[PDB]
Amino acid sequence: KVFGRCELAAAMKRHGLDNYRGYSLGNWVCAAKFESNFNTQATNRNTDGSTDYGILQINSRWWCNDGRTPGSRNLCNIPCSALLSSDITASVNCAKKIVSDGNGMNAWVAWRNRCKGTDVQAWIRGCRL
Ligand SMILES: [Cl-]
Ligand SMILES: [Cl-]
């Protein structure tokens, strides 16, 4: 599913992400934009052979099981394919664990490089919510 911007903001809000660990809704929307272009089916292989999955490109090295990432964990206790669903519940629940792990949204390198220090509120500007 490719979310609209305001549609994704609203789904994230409903799942308790606006201001989760202090990170306003625009932070999450912006991260999603640059991680997946709002496509729940996005997958990308990493150099290390781990894979990033879904709207927030959650990585198989620590967070989900895909069966092909040697020496990995599955700290969200989820198959990585659950992160590709049209329903973002699994991605949001697992993002909450990630952003609580000590480095906040710096866990997302694309958030650090493309969202952090920007007018992230622009990502939810105009949205009803
Ligand atoms: Cl915001
Ligand atoms: Cl933080």
Give the residue from 98, 105, 124 showing the smallest Cα distance to 11.
124
Given 35, 48, 66, 87, which residue is catalytic?
A: 35
Domains of the chain, CATH where assigned: 1-129 (1.10.530.10)
- C-alpha 25 to ligand 1 mean position (Å): 5
- C-alpha 49 to ligand 2 mean position (Å): 28
Method: X-ray
Look at the alpha carbons of 69, 102, 98, 112 in this order and tell me if their dihedral is positive or negative: negative
- Is 7 considered catalytic here? no
CB 21 within 8 A of CB 28: no
DSSP structural state of residue 65: B
Residues annotated within the binding site for substrate are 101
C-alpha to C-alpha distance for 7 and 45, rounded to whole angstroms: 27
**DSSP percent split of the chain into helix, strand, coil, nearest 5:** 40, 10, 50
- C-alpha 42 to ligand 1 mean position (Å): 24
